[model samples]
Target chain A: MRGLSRRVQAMKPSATVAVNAKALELRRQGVDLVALTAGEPDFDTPEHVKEAARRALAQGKTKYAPPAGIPELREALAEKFRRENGLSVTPEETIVTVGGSQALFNLFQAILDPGDEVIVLSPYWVSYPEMVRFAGGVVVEVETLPEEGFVPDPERVRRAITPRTKALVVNSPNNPTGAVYPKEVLEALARLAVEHDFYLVSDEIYEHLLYEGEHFSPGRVAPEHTLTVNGAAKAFAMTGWRIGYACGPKEVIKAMASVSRQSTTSPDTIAQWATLEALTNQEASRAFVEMAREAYRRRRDLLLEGLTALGLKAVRPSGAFYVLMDTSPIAPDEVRAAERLLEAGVAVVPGTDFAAFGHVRLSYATSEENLRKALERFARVL
Target chain B: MRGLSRRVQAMKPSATVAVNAKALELRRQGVDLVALTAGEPDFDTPEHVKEAARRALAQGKTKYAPPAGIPELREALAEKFRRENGLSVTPEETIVTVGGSQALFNLFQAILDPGDEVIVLSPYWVSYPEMVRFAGGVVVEVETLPEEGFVPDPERVRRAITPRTKALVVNSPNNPTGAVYPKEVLEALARLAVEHDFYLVSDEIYEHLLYEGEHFSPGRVAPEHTLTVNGAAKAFAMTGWRIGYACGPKEVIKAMASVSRQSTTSPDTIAQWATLEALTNQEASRAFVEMAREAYRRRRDLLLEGLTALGLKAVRPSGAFYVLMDTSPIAPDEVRAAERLLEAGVAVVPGTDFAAFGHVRLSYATSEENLRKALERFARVL
Candidate 1:
């Protein structure tokens, strides 16, 4: 009653975080559980990236960085966007943030006034709507179907746009469902933004995680209308480094950086230096990403084959390491099903927070042996 | 036209940052300017902290930390508060943020709904009003006069509190002004918050840098009502590490952590472990802090004596590292005086943005030799 604002009170507690905590607590108490609730890679940060961090510390890069970011890192980000993302950006148009999440958070804070609408695709990452609403924007969710491999339809996205619409979030190699959008579909989504004069936010954090299709940058099609956000976390297994970078129209990027200036004051300087190494050292970075990508592909195949053999219905994920399995066969609802699975020695997230009904999100980011054990335990819940 | 919200558009471009950039540019061109515009320590991080950071990197502690922070760091913070600042807080009541700035930013976002009022002390740190307004809180400023050594008067603060008042910010060993408020004054301010049914935010980032008086914690008096914010930045000279922490009522801290969960995720993992070393390793930490404190005291005395000898007026700073020199003797206003100082081969921040008129902030955080050289250049401006 005393400490919370109406805005904070309005925030529903994160179901994913809650279940993960419970699973963690059980493990702490010596219970044997096959936990799969993580949203990050299992790999340690690559040797090359860790070396850069140590070098930064030795060089005494432990001082305040400029509010936007260090120039060297920003310069490298522009080159990465051009070479890897195909988005032609200048250093001034790039902003480094605390994580890919902050890039999205700051973008919304920079663009959305109260009552402005942002159309998000459903079965989306749990944070999209929360971040949009936190910035005083209205959340307008448009569902992406499992039948269509959770790919967003541009026509449905177009129908959701109104005069009040300020932005649309498009995440591919997407979280939760692991769907990857077709190139033409991404282009069509970019075209919708250009047609409507609203901002298009492209979250490409999972860009290098794709297994079946090539990654496309909507910013390559509509550079002026799109803000392309990506980070070292997913690609280089540097989640705790907390470094994210984005490129967009210079004016919007500067606006986003201004929000950073008053909050977080740029990111950890050592991490920024480490991420510069992640971006620039092509040979080392490639070896690491390819290794993780290959491992993730194998893990996904093993998990999917086991689920199919057990007669559990799931949309086969093509990119990211998650699968949204239909849980109606196990229990009446997702929450009850997640509980039953926990009782059977497997921990998974109920998809209620992600707005996915009657589903559970399972991660293949763990070891193949762990996934095999999970499938065995998962059978008992069924 | 498409990139900004009213909230962002309203942010005043930082006058301090602009001058610092201009000075930095001049130095880059080999102009040999004596710069005094920093708000952070010039000293590198201590050896023990760096060792811990390197150890964390070596041990592969590069994973996502809990949103509130790593439990070890939070436990260390609780012990730090209780033993050092007389704050009886549990680990659950603590929150670790990206910086001290984010603790304030998230606190405002957690408590202030649209149009709620927060009373701020004038001549405050530049980020206070900005963070408040960004969270949809209106700022009501209460002035602390130069004649009063810039200490806040609780009676004036009481006058500012109204039905809409959500919080009051009290920075002791205050930024920009360097005034360390007396314990009774802090107690009175805390009492006002309890009386008015609003939050009391005590920013004690400069607590360890105090020269003349003992530091006090208002949380000792109003543990439920006051949020005590401090960080490793000032104490450990770890500004670039980006670790800040705060403790107060459990509900408020959790609300703040919720905002962080959607923003930065958490402070960098390696930095958190590094800060744990800074807190728990009392012998090394105290030696470093004492060395830094003694250096700062000597520099402050040198700068103060030089200003007095030259007949340039300044309120003697008892804590922190900045001196707000009265600019009327040098020019017509702060901006013009700051420009004149720049022309004389010295860089200083005009106090215009800090709601401080007719004054300029000169940091003594640099070496004594730099301060001596700056004083000679300062004599020319006079």
Candidate 2:
């Protein structure tokens, strides 16, 4: 009777976090290793955003904001969705959350019921299935083969759909694989949601992290059937600030705000104002993003060239900051491969929890020098 | 098929929020009304805490923290729990959340199953039952009459416990009623939880707001069977910073962290650092609390004397900033009475949603001038 609920007990520990912890412990013990395990930008939050936070502090904005968000931030979000993402939304349809993570978390909670099925693409961000299952929804994983660069095929996704399906998650510039779905593919996914009458939760937190091609929002095709989730974390390097926003159907968005009222009450007020500056001061925020993207691209290219010279295989990533490298030369499985890499003075997240077997996820969110060091360590392991 | 889930639809909107929105609207339209419906301290967050936030920003502490919290804050929370509440807890037995609201929300999700009963005292904070229901748990209400200073009787709580009872919630320096339970009563409630093998949730967010009696935590009596919830919001006026903490059974705390991982990930990283200052810098934090408490005490006395002189019947609050005043003299019910009070240019929260049927909740967290103005408006209503 005093035990944890069934849901919490069933929750899987995050593999990414577990590896990062081990890396941290090793460093604390004075082991010097390059870590490619970060899930955020290596850059400090933009100066303009930090200045906004200071301004909020000076102006006494330290009070409970409305559960949805502060009105000015909500208005800024509406504009961002329209001008940047090409999604038409009013301020009332937008809700701010703790981060992009909470936007997805609340979206699932607002739509999923017991036994409701949610379609998730394999090799996904680790939290997606965890969030779905935690909300009492069943996760139906559709696999995307490595041969396809980890791009989810609509045909495969269509096979996973059933009458019990309540939602489908599409994270473009995909995590781990860094595969950005083409606009045509995104359109097809949107059509499937509208036809199947299931909600499409579009996670565009990495919309600004593209190394090539344009970022396309599926919400543009089916606004009524889509929830566009984006945040300040990856775009403006404000992960610690914990500000995320989502726009969707009015009813669902309102329901999500109600859930917020009973949970966190609202996101941090200073973070909301800071995020408002990130959105409103487009010139400054865009400059930071471009600078960060260039840095990441250089790191990515350096890491890729090193792996290629060593005859290691990995798909050339077009967006995001991660690379899923084949672990065939290191070990029989990804976990063992990650262990071997750690022993060779590098840290990488095993892809097991992401349904990305036989591969390890490497992040290029670090400096070029660190990536070169990690690549040299990989050579020594071989 | 596109309908929102039953879980979200089942969430009842807070009447308190509805009233607050109307008050905000009226103020926006230039209505010069005295509003007494705030649930947060009117005082600014302590300078020490704000300084800590600036320090964190300057140090580039702008990345994702562990889902439970940063290690330093958890250690500080452990020390705070030991020094302030006489509760023995390790860092592993403590967890941080977005707010005190999330602490309770995550607790319910981590413990309750469908139809499991959670005993709640009436005249409760509106979110108590809402959070319980949101987690698919049944709420069993036990009335704490205004005649008894709104302290829950242990005998009544015992009668409410059944085989299905999974938890019992005790909020001392109670919200709405502001009744601080006697130490003997809290011990009795803790004993009930131990005897019945149910968890006792102690929400002591208002621990520093006491006026008449010393604050006691039930967790000291039933550590294994209790979850102690507290926050910096009410104590240091850090409500908008959004950092709350809890300590309890190690297993339960771990489960709460898992729930957080699937939800908000972690609270705002900057807020966590700010709270670390509030916990560690005892002198500065205590000075701020004493100043705010003295201010609240004066306002409470002034409002109470004014009401008594106006022949308004209400129980004098011993803790928190709220007072539950009898509406019998103004209108037949709380809704009508609240409407009448609004017409007189004094906004108060109707106790309909808080389950205090014939009373209305008034907060003295505002200025003495506002309290004096509200008292004059109350005289007009009479």
Candidate 3:
């Protein structure tokens, strides 16, 4: 008798949110927990970007922007894609969104019909499958093995595709697993999209956060079939600003913008202006990114070394700020292991929702001090 | 074979955007036009709100907020709803969104199943039907007459309700028509919702813009069956900031937040903080609203007098900055009349998208000089 729509009722609430809520509850009860569950950088947004927002506010650039975005930001995005990724795209092919999440959400809404299949790699970001299902798309997951450092085999992905497949999501410098897919692997995946004539949904939000290996844009190999999504949130520590951008075929971008117009009207104009500064001020933005990356790299090394010394198994991450630690020693399953970790005074994300069974995701986005405390708790739990 | 999904393909691009594109093209070609088509207040956002945003930037409030909103904003929203509308709601019942648009969008996605029907008043805000259809709900339009000051007739609304009706939309101080439904009419609608066991979706964005009568919220009559949507955009001249809020049943609000987590994540964090200041510093906010209302009143009077002197008919608007003027004098239909007006150097929104035939919507959100110029152009066109 509940009136909720079939789609929404079917929609899964975020597992990360659920876990964070539990952590909050415990903290309220005065538990001393070292949380390693952050999905964003701990750094403040760059001063140059914040200064641009102040300038916009002062200049009264505070009116409804075009639904896609302010033209200047889209232009900047086009330039960014061209110069940084070797992906040729015009401004008309780019559209700005509320965040990288919204870019993917709108893309799914634009392309996925009922019963359409989207290929997702297991150990995926938790939102990927949820978004596809909400848009009436079925998800076909190809399992990536922790034994292989969480990298997907191109052949395995091919077998998951069928006639119903409409798009394939590839998040490299990935979430949770932090595997930066090699350039050869990325090209192979892009070739599959070309061969199958399905869209390639490339999420490159963490392109700037890699600790090893060069980042690759699949769009360079299959430009016509690729929709490349990126944002200021991870790169510039502008998550709260909520600005993301995508570049793809003109028709696809236009369709995504239409979905946006009906959904959110437009992203916040001030944030769009702030993001413009992040893109245009290359030196300042790069400095901030470098600073953040080096800090993350140091934390990742410390955490990995500690976990290894404790005889706990984890995939050594080369990109992003997350590591998927095997929870087999702590408990029989990831969820139980997460509980044990909490009991030992550290909070982490169970990999249950991300299809990373037998593991838990730990982020290094927090301070080194917090990471050290979490590592200490991990040692106790072991 | 086009690759876009049936849903995105079926979604119609906004007519307002089409007209605005033409207007922009003309202006870029160095044409001078007195545009009376703004949907937001022309006033700059208040200094207090801007100050709050600066403070937030200084405090590094640039991380992702909770999917619903920042806790402080939700608390302020609870207070705003309770104090301003006599609607008792707790913080759990309140949600902050990208704009009033996203609030409605999420609400529809939460509650509408395929084939479910939503009743809308004609000459309604253009986004209402689009958002419903996007969520797989059918739009059932009930006519509101200019002769009745664009107010919905309760009997006509009753006739439109069906067993499949899931919600009825009531937009007082309505967009496009500027109609403010009287308190008794609002109460009757609320009663119908209770009797039908359906929701009453109230768009109270223009509540503080009234010129002739006291504002009434139907949520006060049937709190459980009502979702009251409002925003800082219209009220605080913060349209570019993109913050809107709704307060209703806790279950429904939770469902809406779930939709948000899968979509935009959250509204801009800085904007939410800015809006918190707007709600908490009510004295400054109320003053800005009053000043905007007085300026709008003056412009409305001048435009109404000019139209009347030219023998052009219009239903005098009681609230909002818009007036629906009969297009019969200039051309056979609203579209043709709008084109003629554009040629005569004034741009206005055609009523076709809003379901107001043989009419065009004019805005007085610009300066008095622009209003006078537009009136002169209207005389020439006639």
**CAPRI-style grade of the A/B interface in model 1:** medium
Which pairs of residues have clashing backbones in candidate 1?
A: none
Model 3 agreement with the true structure over B1-382: per-residue lDDT tens digits: 1299887888765566677778888899988999888899999999999999999999999999999999988998899899999999999999999999999999999999878999999988888998899888899999999888889899999999889999999998899888888999999999999988999999999999999988999999899999999998887898989899999989999999999999999999999899899999988888898898899899999999999999999999999899999999899998878877888899999988999999989999999999988888887876
Among the numbered candidates, top DockQ falls to 2
lDDT (tens digit, per residue) of candidate 2 on B69-143: 999999999999999999999999999999999999999999998889999999888889989999889999999
What lDDT score is found at residue A248 in candidate 3? 93
What is the fnat value (0 to 1) for candidate 1?
A: 0.77
lDDT (Cα, tens digit) per residue for candidate 1, span A1-382: 1458877888877666677777777788888998788889999999988999889999999999988899999999989999988889999999999999899999999999889999999898988999998888899989999888899888898889899989999898899899999999999999989988989999999999999989999999899999999999998999998999899999999999999989999899999999999988999999988999999999999998898999999998889889999998999989888878887899999999999989999988899999999999987976
Compute the interface RMSD for each candidate structure.
1.5, 0.9, 1.5
Give lDDT tens digits, candidate 2, residues A1-382: 5778888888766566676777778889999988888889889999999999999998889999989999999999999999998998999999999998888888888898889999999898998988998888899999998899888889999999899988898999889799999999999999999999999999999999999989999989899999999898888888888999999999999989888988999999999999899999999998998898888888888989999999999999999899999999999998888878888999898999999999999998888878878888888998
- Pairs with steric clashes in candidate 2: none
For all the predictions, what are the DockQ values?
0.73, 0.86, 0.75
Residue-wise C-alpha lDDT for candidate 3, range A1-382, written one tens digit per residue: 1267888778755565666777788898989998888899889988999999999999998899988999999899889999999999999999999999999999999999899999999899988998999999999999999888888899999998889999999999999899999999999999999998899999999999999999999999998999999998899998999999999999999999998888788898889988999999999988998899889999999999988899999999999999999898899988888888887889999999999889899999998899888877777776
Model 2 off-target regions past 4 Å?
A: A13-29, B17-30
Query: What lDDT does candidate 3 reach at residue B111?
Result: 96
Evaluate residue A322 in candidate 1 and report its C-alpha lDDT on the 0 to 100 scale.
Answer: 92
Q: Give the C-alpha miss distance for residue A276 in model 1, angstroms.
A: 0.5
